[PDB]
């Protein structure tokens, strides 16, 4: 009884911004993938920290699922040991990560001809994130560390919008991402 | 009844050369990964053609398993859409591949300080292989296509040995590869 709430993960109408990534717990449930929508085709499906003795982990029966959107060229940062703005300041996996990263192109729902700017990422921060840390503040940033009031000079806004347009290359298109941690 | 022949696949003492890659069918059985070896940790675990409604394919219940050895720098050729000597002349995945590619570093058992030369690959051929095609011939090769009898000019032997040494970078180290097709 109780089927896994994978629909809430893969088929959610809205996905979070990566700076505001969301986690859902999946445990103590039966998996029925037949009640998900068809046509969710993973262009990335990469698993880390898996051993032959623990191949049963790919049944996904006890899992945390983290969801967010990035641009295509940033999907490579959702891996252990990566650097760049997403890994450093938004969503960080541990080096010893045990889990899988799934991504799929969502140009058709997440991009517009006029530009969808609803998804954001943090580009400035005082410190990189530890693994599975999350920062949701939107506080003026000063390089020197001092508190800071716009329009003061050397005072910056730490988030930047992705701009998702319908007529750009794949590296600039939106990807929904789900990271499953074996647990 | 019947526990999966995964031991035969993952735990074999000798692996095939990639030109002479081997296939094993795994179906009508229940998995017991416990008897497999601890210490087999996959440095590559990448799945292709998966969709959300087919996530259960990752239980690996009905599956062909292809095994062989390549060097580290060649593992990237074991993916859909790749070119190079291995993809072209040894082992070809189709563009529409539905399955997972697993690899792990085996310097410890497949490389020697003196050089292990038991693993081979084809480096000369007239034409690229079709997906899942296997060529185990070893007849002399002429670039003009004509029949060939060594020791004549423009006559060559089409297979080369990998040389696996203990004291080399990871790109030159041996990797055991298991490709699991959801077929």
Coordinates of C-alpha atoms in Angstrom, one line a residue:
Chain A
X1 CA 0.0 0.0 0.0
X2 CA 1.0 3.7 -0.5
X3 CA 2.6 4.1 -3.9
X4 CA 5.7 6.3 -4.3
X5 CA 4.9 9.9 -4.9
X6 CA 7.2 10.1 -8.0
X7 CA 4.5 12.1 -9.8
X8 CA 5.1 15.0 -7.4
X9 CA 8.7 14.8 -8.4
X10 CA 8.9 14.2 -12.1
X11 CA 5.5 15.6 -13.2
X12 CA 5.3 18.7 -11.0
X13 CA 3.9 21.6 -13.1
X14 CA 6.4 24.0 -11.6
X15 CA 10.0 23.2 -10.7
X16 CA 12.1 25.3 -8.3
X17 CA 15.0 27.6 -9.1
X18 CA 18.3 25.9 -8.4
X19 CA 19.2 28.3 -5.6
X20 CA 15.9 27.3 -4.0
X21 CA 16.1 23.6 -4.8
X22 CA 13.5 21.3 -3.2
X23 CA 13.7 17.9 -1.6
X24 CA 11.2 15.2 -1.4
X25 CA 11.6 11.9 0.6
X26 CA 10.5 8.7 -1.0
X27 CA 10.4 5.6 1.3
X28 CA 8.1 2.8 2.5
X29 CA 6.1 2.7 -0.7
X30 CA 5.5 0.7 -3.8
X31 CA 6.8 2.1 -7.1
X32 CA 4.3 2.5 -9.9
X33 CA 6.0 4.3 -12.8
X34 CA 2.9 3.6 -15.0
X35 CA 1.0 6.6 -13.5
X36 CA 3.7 9.1 -14.5
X37 CA 3.2 10.9 -17.8
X38 CA 4.8 9.4 -20.9
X39 CA 7.5 11.3 -22.8
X40 CA 9.8 12.3 -19.9
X41 CA 13.0 11.1 -21.6
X42 CA 16.2 11.6 -19.6
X43 CA 19.1 13.1 -21.6
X44 CA 21.3 12.7 -18.5
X45 CA 21.1 9.6 -16.4
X46 CA 24.4 9.3 -14.4
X47 CA 24.9 7.4 -11.2
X48 CA 27.8 7.9 -8.7
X49 CA 29.2 5.8 -5.8
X50 CA 27.4 2.6 -7.0
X51 CA 29.0 -0.8 -6.3
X52 CA 28.1 -4.2 -7.6
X53 CA 26.9 -5.4 -4.2
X54 CA 24.6 -2.4 -3.9
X55 CA 22.9 -2.5 -7.4
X56 CA 19.6 -3.0 -5.6
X57 CA 19.8 0.8 -4.9
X58 CA 18.7 1.4 -8.5
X59 CA 15.2 0.3 -7.5
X60 CA 14.9 3.8 -5.9
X61 CA 12.8 2.5 -3.0
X62 CA 14.5 4.6 -0.3
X63 CA 15.6 7.9 -1.7
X64 CA 15.7 11.7 -1.4
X65 CA 14.8 13.5 -4.6
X66 CA 16.1 17.0 -5.2
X67 CA 14.5 19.1 -8.0
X68 CA 15.5 22.2 -9.8
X69 CA 16.1 23.9 -13.2
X70 CA 19.4 24.8 -14.8
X71 CA 20.5 25.7 -18.4
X72 CA 21.9 22.8 -20.5
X73 CA 25.5 23.9 -20.2
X74 CA 25.2 23.9 -16.3
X75 CA 23.9 20.3 -16.1
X76 CA 27.5 19.1 -16.0
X77 CA 27.9 20.9 -12.6
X78 CA 25.4 18.5 -11.0
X79 CA 28.1 15.9 -10.4
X80 CA 30.6 15.2 -7.6
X81 CA 33.8 17.2 -7.7
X82 CA 32.6 20.0 -10.1
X83 CA 33.2 23.7 -9.9
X84 CA 31.4 26.6 -11.4
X85 CA 28.6 28.9 -10.2
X86 CA 26.0 26.2 -9.7
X87 CA 28.1 23.8 -7.8
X88 CA 29.8 26.5 -5.7
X89 CA 26.8 28.7 -4.8
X90 CA 23.6 26.9 -5.5
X91 CA 23.6 23.1 -5.3
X92 CA 26.6 21.0 -4.2
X93 CA 27.0 17.2 -4.3
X94 CA 29.6 15.6 -2.0
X95 CA 32.7 13.9 -3.5
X96 CA 31.4 10.5 -2.0
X97 CA 27.9 11.0 -3.5
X98 CA 25.9 7.8 -3.8
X99 CA 23.0 8.4 -6.1
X100 CA 21.9 9.3 -9.6
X101 CA 21.4 12.6 -11.5
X102 CA 18.5 12.7 -14.1
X103 CA 17.9 15.6 -16.5
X104 CA 15.6 16.3 -19.3
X105 CA 15.2 19.1 -21.8
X106 CA 12.2 21.2 -21.1
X107 CA 12.4 23.9 -23.8
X108 CA 8.7 23.3 -24.6
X109 CA 7.5 24.1 -21.1
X110 CA 10.1 26.2 -19.5
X111 CA 11.2 28.5 -22.5
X112 CA 9.2 31.2 -24.4
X113 CA 9.8 33.1 -27.7
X114 CA 9.8 36.3 -25.5
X115 CA 12.1 34.8 -22.8
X116 CA 11.2 33.1 -19.6
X117 CA 13.1 34.8 -16.8
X118 CA 11.3 33.1 -13.8
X119 CA 14.3 30.8 -13.0
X120 CA 17.3 32.2 -11.1
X121 CA 20.7 31.3 -9.8
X122 CA 23.1 32.7 -7.1
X123 CA 26.3 34.0 -8.6
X124 CA 27.8 35.9 -5.6
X125 CA 28.3 34.5 -2.2
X126 CA 30.6 34.7 0.8
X127 CA 31.7 31.1 0.8
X128 CA 31.0 28.0 -1.3
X129 CA 28.2 25.7 -0.2
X130 CA 28.9 22.5 1.7
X131 CA 27.2 19.4 0.1
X132 CA 23.4 19.6 0.3
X133 CA 23.4 23.1 1.8
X134 CA 20.9 25.6 0.6
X135 CA 20.8 29.4 0.7
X136 CA 17.6 31.2 -0.1
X137 CA 18.6 34.8 1.1
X138 CA 18.5 37.7 -1.3
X139 CA 20.7 40.2 0.5
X140 CA 22.8 42.9 -1.1
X141 CA 26.4 41.6 -1.5
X142 CA 29.6 43.5 -0.9
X143 CA 32.9 41.9 -1.9
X144 CA 34.6 43.3 1.3
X145 CA 32.0 41.4 3.5
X146 CA 30.5 44.6 4.9
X147 CA 26.7 45.0 5.0
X148 CA 25.5 47.0 2.1
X149 CA 22.7 49.2 1.0
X150 CA 21.8 49.8 -2.7
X151 CA 22.3 52.2 -4.4
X152 CA 25.7 52.3 -2.6
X153 CA 28.7 51.6 -4.8
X154 CA 30.3 48.1 -4.6
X155 CA 26.9 46.7 -3.6
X156 CA 25.5 43.9 -5.7
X157 CA 22.5 41.7 -6.1
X158 CA 23.6 38.1 -5.7
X159 CA 20.9 36.4 -7.9
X160 CA 20.8 36.4 -11.7
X161 CA 17.8 35.3 -13.8
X162 CA 18.3 32.6 -16.5
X163 CA 16.7 33.8 -19.7
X164 CA 15.1 30.9 -21.5
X165 CA 14.3 31.5 -25.1
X166 CA 12.7 29.3 -27.7
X167 CA 15.3 30.0 -30.5
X168 CA 18.6 29.2 -28.9
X169 CA 21.1 26.3 -28.8
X170 CA 20.7 23.3 -26.5
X171 CA 23.4 24.7 -24.0
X172 CA 21.1 27.6 -23.3
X173 CA 17.9 25.7 -23.1
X174 CA 16.2 24.7 -19.7
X175 CA 16.7 21.3 -18.2
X176 CA 14.7 20.0 -15.3
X177 CA 16.9 18.0 -13.0
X178 CA 16.2 15.4 -10.3
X179 CA 19.0 14.1 -8.1
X180 CA 18.2 10.9 -6.3
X181 CA 20.4 10.1 -3.2
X182 CA 20.6 6.5 -2.1
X183 CA 19.5 6.4 1.5
Chain B
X1 CA 14.0 -19.6 -8.4
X2 CA 17.4 -19.3 -10.3
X3 CA 19.5 -16.4 -9.1
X4 CA 20.9 -14.1 -11.7
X5 CA 24.1 -15.0 -13.5
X6 CA 25.6 -11.6 -12.6
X7 CA 28.6 -13.3 -11.0
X8 CA 29.5 -14.8 -14.3
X9 CA 29.3 -11.3 -15.8
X10 CA 30.9 -9.0 -13.1
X11 CA 33.1 -11.5 -11.3
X12 CA 34.7 -13.4 -14.2
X13 CA 38.5 -13.9 -13.8
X14 CA 39.3 -13.0 -17.4
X15 CA 37.2 -10.5 -19.4
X16 CA 36.9 -10.6 -23.2
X17 CA 38.9 -8.4 -25.6
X18 CA 36.6 -5.7 -27.0
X19 CA 36.9 -7.0 -30.6
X20 CA 35.6 -10.4 -29.3
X21 CA 33.1 -9.0 -26.8
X22 CA 30.7 -11.4 -25.1
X23 CA 27.0 -11.3 -24.5
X24 CA 25.1 -13.0 -21.7
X25 CA 21.3 -13.0 -21.4
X26 CA 19.9 -12.5 -17.9
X27 CA 16.2 -13.1 -17.5
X28 CA 13.7 -15.3 -15.6
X29 CA 15.7 -15.0 -12.4
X30 CA 15.9 -13.2 -9.1
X31 CA 18.9 -11.0 -8.3
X32 CA 21.2 -11.5 -5.4
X33 CA 23.9 -8.9 -5.6
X34 CA 25.3 -9.8 -2.1
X35 CA 27.4 -12.7 -3.6
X36 CA 29.0 -10.3 -6.1
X37 CA 32.2 -8.7 -5.0
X38 CA 32.4 -5.8 -2.7
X39 CA 35.3 -3.6 -4.1
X40 CA 33.7 -3.4 -7.6
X41 CA 32.8 0.3 -7.6
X42 CA 31.6 1.7 -10.9
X43 CA 33.5 4.8 -12.1
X44 CA 31.1 5.0 -15.0
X45 CA 27.4 4.3 -14.7
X46 CA 25.5 6.0 -17.5
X47 CA 22.1 5.2 -18.8
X48 CA 20.6 6.0 -22.2
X49 CA 17.1 6.0 -23.6
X50 CA 15.5 5.9 -20.2
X51 CA 12.2 7.6 -19.6
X52 CA 10.3 8.1 -16.4
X53 CA 7.6 5.5 -17.1
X54 CA 10.4 2.9 -17.7
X55 CA 12.4 3.5 -14.5
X56 CA 11.8 -0.1 -13.5
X57 CA 14.2 -1.1 -16.2
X58 CA 17.0 -0.3 -13.7
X59 CA 16.0 -3.4 -11.7
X60 CA 17.9 -5.2 -14.5
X61 CA 15.5 -8.1 -14.5
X62 CA 15.3 -8.7 -18.3
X63 CA 18.6 -7.8 -19.8
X64 CA 21.5 -8.6 -22.2
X65 CA 25.0 -8.0 -20.7
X66 CA 28.0 -7.3 -22.9
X67 CA 31.4 -7.4 -21.4
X68 CA 34.9 -6.5 -22.6
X69 CA 38.0 -4.4 -21.6
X70 CA 39.1 -1.1 -22.9
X71 CA 41.6 1.5 -21.6
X72 CA 40.4 4.5 -19.7
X73 CA 40.6 7.0 -22.6
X74 CA 38.4 4.6 -24.7
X75 CA 35.5 4.2 -22.2
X76 CA 33.9 7.4 -23.6
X77 CA 33.4 5.6 -26.9
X78 CA 31.0 3.2 -25.3
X79 CA 28.0 5.5 -25.7
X80 CA 25.5 6.3 -28.5
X81 CA 26.8 8.7 -31.2
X82 CA 30.5 8.2 -30.6
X83 CA 33.3 7.7 -33.2
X84 CA 36.8 6.4 -32.7
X85 CA 38.5 3.0 -33.1
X86 CA 36.5 1.2 -30.5
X87 CA 33.0 2.6 -31.5
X88 CA 33.8 2.2 -35.3
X89 CA 35.6 -1.1 -35.4
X90 CA 35.0 -3.1 -32.2
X91 CA 31.8 -2.3 -30.3
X92 CA 29.0 -0.1 -31.6
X93 CA 25.9 1.2 -29.6
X94 CA 23.0 2.4 -31.7
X95 CA 21.9 6.0 -31.5
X96 CA 18.6 4.8 -30.0
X97 CA 20.3 2.6 -27.3
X98 CA 18.2 1.8 -24.3
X99 CA 20.4 0.6 -21.5
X100 CA 23.3 1.3 -19.1
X101 CA 27.1 1.4 -19.5
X102 CA 29.0 0.3 -16.4
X103 CA 32.8 0.5 -16.1
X104 CA 35.4 0.1 -13.4
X105 CA 39.1 0.6 -13.1
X106 CA 41.0 -2.7 -13.0
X107 CA 44.7 -1.6 -12.8
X108 CA 45.0 -4.1 -9.9
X109 CA 44.1 -7.3 -11.8
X110 CA 44.6 -6.3 -15.5
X111 CA 47.8 -4.2 -15.4
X112 CA 51.4 -5.5 -14.6
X113 CA 54.6 -3.6 -14.0
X114 CA 55.9 -5.6 -17.0
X115 CA 52.8 -4.9 -19.2
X116 CA 49.8 -7.1 -19.8
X117 CA 49.2 -7.5 -23.5
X118 CA 46.4 -10.1 -23.4
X119 CA 43.7 -7.6 -24.3
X120 CA 43.2 -6.7 -28.0
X121 CA 41.3 -4.3 -30.3
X122 CA 40.8 -4.0 -34.0
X123 CA 42.3 -0.8 -35.5
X124 CA 41.9 -1.5 -39.2
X125 CA 38.7 -2.3 -41.0
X126 CA 36.9 -1.6 -44.2
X127 CA 33.8 0.2 -42.9
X128 CA 32.4 0.9 -39.5
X129 CA 30.4 -1.8 -37.7
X130 CA 26.6 -1.7 -37.4
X131 CA 25.3 -1.5 -33.9
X132 CA 25.8 -4.7 -31.9
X133 CA 27.9 -6.1 -34.8
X134 CA 30.8 -8.3 -33.8
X135 CA 33.9 -9.0 -36.0
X136 CA 36.4 -11.7 -34.7
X137 CA 38.3 -12.2 -38.0
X138 CA 42.0 -11.7 -38.2
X139 CA 42.8 -11.7 -41.9
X140 CA 45.4 -9.4 -43.4
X141 CA 44.2 -5.9 -44.3
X142 CA 45.0 -4.0 -47.5
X143 CA 44.0 -0.3 -47.7
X144 CA 43.0 -0.8 -51.4
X145 CA 40.7 -3.6 -50.4
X146 CA 42.4 -6.4 -52.4
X147 CA 43.3 -9.8 -50.9
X148 CA 46.5 -9.8 -48.9
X149 CA 49.3 -12.3 -48.1
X150 CA 52.1 -11.2 -45.7
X151 CA 55.0 -10.4 -46.1
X152 CA 53.8 -8.3 -49.0
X153 CA 53.7 -4.4 -49.1
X154 CA 50.6 -2.5 -48.1
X155 CA 49.5 -5.6 -46.1
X156 CA 48.8 -5.2 -42.4
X157 CA 47.5 -7.1 -39.4
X158 CA 44.2 -5.5 -38.1
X159 CA 44.4 -6.2 -34.4
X160 CA 46.7 -4.5 -31.9
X161 CA 47.3 -5.4 -28.2
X162 CA 46.6 -2.9 -25.5
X163 CA 49.7 -2.7 -23.2
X164 CA 48.5 -2.4 -19.6
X165 CA 51.3 -1.2 -17.2
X166 CA 50.9 -0.4 -13.5
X167 CA 52.8 3.0 -13.6
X168 CA 50.7 5.0 -16.1
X169 CA 48.0 7.7 -16.0
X170 CA 44.4 6.6 -15.6
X171 CA 43.7 7.1 -19.3
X172 CA 46.0 4.2 -20.1
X173 CA 44.8 1.9 -17.3
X174 CA 42.4 -1.0 -18.0
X175 CA 38.7 -0.8 -17.4
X176 CA 36.2 -3.6 -17.3
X177 CA 33.0 -2.6 -19.1
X178 CA 29.5 -4.2 -18.8
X179 CA 26.9 -2.9 -21.1
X180 CA 23.3 -3.8 -20.0
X181 CA 20.7 -3.6 -22.8
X182 CA 17.0 -3.3 -21.8
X183 CA 16.0 -5.9 -24.5

